[PDB]
Amino acid sequence: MNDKHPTPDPAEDNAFFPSAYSLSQFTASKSDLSGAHYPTPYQGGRWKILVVGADERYLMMDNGTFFSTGNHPVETLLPMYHLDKAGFSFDIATLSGNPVKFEWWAMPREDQEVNGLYSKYQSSFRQPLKLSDVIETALGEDSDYIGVFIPGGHGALMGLPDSQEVKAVLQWAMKQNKFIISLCHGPAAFLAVGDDPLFAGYKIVAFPDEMDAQTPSIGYMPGHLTWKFGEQLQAIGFELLNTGISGQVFQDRKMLTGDSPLAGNALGQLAAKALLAEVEQ
Numbered sequence: 001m002n003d004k005h006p007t008p009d010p011a012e013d014n015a016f017f018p019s020a021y022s023l024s025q026f027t028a029s030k031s032d033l034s035g036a037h038y039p040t041p042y043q044g045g046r047w048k049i050l051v052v053g054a055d056e057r058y059l060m061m062d063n064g065t066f067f068s069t070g071n072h073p074v075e076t077l078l079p080m081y082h083l084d085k086a087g088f089s090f091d092i093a094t095l096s097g098n099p100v101k102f103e104w105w106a107m108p109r110e111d112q113e114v115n116g117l118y119s120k121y122q123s124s125f126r127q128p129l130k131l132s133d134v135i136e137t138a139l140g141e142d143s144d145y146i147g148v149f150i151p152g153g154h155g156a157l158m159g160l161p162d163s164q165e166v167k168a169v170l171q172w173a174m175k176q177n178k179f180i181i182s183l184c185h186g187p188a189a190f191l192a193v194g195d196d197p198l199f200a201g202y203k204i205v206a207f208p209d210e211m212d213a214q215t216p217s218i219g220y221m222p223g224h225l226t227w228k229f230g231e232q233l234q235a236i237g238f239e240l241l242n243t244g245i246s247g248q249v250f251q252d253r254k255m256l257t258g259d260s261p262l263a264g265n266a267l268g269q270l271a272a273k274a275l276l277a278e279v280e281q
Contacts, residue, residue: 006065006222015058015066017105019219026220029110031074032265033081038272041087042279047146049083049181049275050138051076051092052166052189053100053128054155061223069221070101072153073118074108075184075264079149081117082268086276088146090121091138095159095166097130103153106261131165139172146275147254148173152184152207152261154221157229166192173254174198179278181271183249183258188229191236200237203252205259206230208243 001024006016018026053076058066080090094100102125108114118125138145148169150156160166170193173180182189187206190199209230216224230240241250247262249270256274258267 004219006219009068012058012066012068014064015068016222017068018221022215022218022220023105025218026261027106029108031078031108031111031114033078033111033113034265035269036082036085038086038276041085042276043087044279046144047279048089048091048144050134050145050148050169051090052131052148052150052160052169053092053094053125054153054158054160055094055096055098055101056155056158057101059154059158060226061221062226063223065222067154067221067223069154070103071151071155072106072184072261073102073104074106074114075153075186075258075261076102076151077114077117078264079151079181079268079271080121081113082272083275084117086272088275090124091129091134092121092124093129093131093134095131095163097128100125100128101155103155131169135165135168139169141176143176145178146278147179147181150182150186150189152182152186154185156185157188157225160189161191161229162194163192167194167196171196171198177254179254179256179271179275181256181267183263183267184260185229187233187257190238191229191232193236197237201239202237202255203239203241203250204233204255204257205242205248205250206233206240206257207260208245211245
């Protein structure tokens, strides 16, 4: 209960879930989902949002252990929940086409609304599209995507940050003036553009590197991260706005970001409002 030892994951050798203590502090049985009420939702039936999810659960730490991570389900589902109520549908993809991997230990088991939304999308999380197919047939000048959503969780730190596929998607979104929506560790994916200065001067919130340096001290992760995505984001032009976390969000043009696992509800409100205002041409 107050145990700070990482919790072995029976599926994978030398792999650990967060400690029982860290779970009692950083997860809850209910979310703070609120204000998802849009009286005049989009009903045009065209515009959709592309979700780029994590296909891996096991992240290699600096001491040889695997953190049993994935996408954070609250960070994933709260924004979707608002966008759903606003009238937008989702297509879900991973790099490999393998199933989206959730941090199930952060899923709020008592939250009827959040569990209802997962039920609606579960077939797509479990059997997602392969991003290469999306890039081949669903983007370009006349795409039906109004935006792209890249949820956080430390799973976002694998593959996405240097995928040439993610690069193509981000280049397309900026070129075609589409929304890019992310939070927490999700913005690590933005690194995929490599040395393309496309994001120079953009302002975002993201999970602070300094906090990643400290959570393993209470067993949240079984080791430390082998690199620092915040510093890398700064190095390609991003201004990181936040030192700590509070669940806040920022909109810089069509780039919408949230700061942490506290930011899902606010990011949903922000995204729904922006996309509703947009759907007007």
